[model samples]
Target chain A: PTTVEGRNDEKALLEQLVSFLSGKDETELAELDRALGIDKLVQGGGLDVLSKLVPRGSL
Target chain B: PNRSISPSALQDLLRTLKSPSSPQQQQQVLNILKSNPQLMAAFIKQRTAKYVANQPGM
Candidate 1:
């Protein structure tokens, strides 16, 4: 089991994100991701997609 | 910036710059081209800000 950090059980969520981002250029993903305008952590409930779906705090 | 900085980071940056006949001059420069905002932001962030204790906010 991967250890989670930061938001929720990030390990599992990150695995999913990694799977999706795989096969794509990391630089391009990071570049495209920049437009979302979210900080490393949302800290608020307003994140439309990433924060809403991404689990927060490990179980 | 001297002893406080990591030897590995300095070494890595220097090594990349020293490469012969490369499209990029250095990893530091490459990193700049890759993510200008992040890299330059970090450069500015490295500068020590003036701080006064006991007279904070001055």
Candidate 2:
């Protein structure tokens, strides 16, 4: 995933989408867009999970 | 209820656009999405359908 970064244009579109859609369901749907490799369209590439899984709590 | 083109099928078609197995697969998926013009029209028209259905809102 290191090869891909800074595709903020897509993130802005997704952000606008979320603002228009306010709910967990919408959030999950947006997350799906992220998971479906749409992260290329989102900032930080939606890597929050990988960051959390970085042994801050496990180790 | 347009049984020939199921809602699930339409959803899957849009989903495939996000990530496809190959360029050919992507092209085919886009074509399938286009096939359900009514579904996409319905979605675009539905003001309530502002958000993507995450919980399989069937």
Candidate 3:
């Protein structure tokens, strides 16, 4: 099933994420942000995470 | 209360929270943090440790 496949993929990604974030200092963390193009994503209104988690006027 | 977030989306949200520009963005991030008590606690703990570590007399 696609849902099961997606879950498996998410688990793998989470494992990698844990490794990536473990034992990192501030500078390296900032580097990850730059590498991810977060600023550009936010500016372009392409970040759907916020909408998914926190809907508008849901606060 | 399980809130499912994709790993990439989680990364994006974390980066945004680190330097949120707009008031709406900040508010949304704050709501996310509030909903996740454990995450908020860890964030405060890490931030406090960093703050203390940066002190001249620490």
Candidate 4:
């Protein structure tokens, strides 16, 4: 089913994202953060999903 | 940094992420995750560990 495949694809994407960032230093992290507009995304509620994924105390 | 998100609010966001009706919003969330791999991986690993520990026979 399409839903099943989509879930697998998303999992793959997450794996790739983590793998790509596995061995980066602070400078690279800063550059990637800037290029990705991470702050803007966070402010835009892009990480609202974390509210569900993570506990309030943990966050 | 400190936002009180209700269950319904979180549900709505999840809906937007999963639905095809709002491709832009979905892509935005995906980009956020893609950009913050360390943060994402940390939380995912933490949660997974907690889950495993909480299992009845694990």
DockQ of each candidate, alpha-carbon based = 0.02, 0.03, 0.06, 0.06
The CA lDDT of each predicted structure is: 0.29, 0.35, 0.38, 0.35
Query: Candidate 2, residues A1-59: lDDT per residue as tens digits?
Result: 11114443333323333323232233344554334333222222123212212211221
For candidate 1, give the docking quality class from DockQ. Answer: incorrect
Candidate 4 docking quality: incorrect, acceptable, medium or high? incorrect
The lDDT-based order of candidates, best leading, equals: 3, 4, 2, 1
TM-score of 1: 0.20
Model 1 chain B scores worst on lDDT over the 10 consecutive residues at B45-54
lDDT of 1 by residue, A1-59 (tens): 22334443323333322222232232243453233212111212222312321222221
What is the C-alpha lDDT profile of model 4 across A1-59, one tens digit per residue?
Answer: 02233444444443333333232222234454333222222322333423322322233
**Stretches of candidate 3 exceeding 4 Å from the true structure:** A1-59, B1-15, B18-22, B55-58
Residue-by-residue lDDT tens digits, candidate 3, A1-47: 02233445544433333333333333344453343323222232223
TM-score of each: 0.20, 0.25, 0.32, 0.21
- What share of the reference contacts survives in each candidate? 0.00, 0.00, 0.06, 0.00
RMSD of each: 19.6, 16.7, 12.4, 14.0
3 against 4, candidate with superior lDDT: 3
- Candidate 3 structure lDDT: 0.38
Question: lDDT of model 2 at residue B12?
Answer: 51
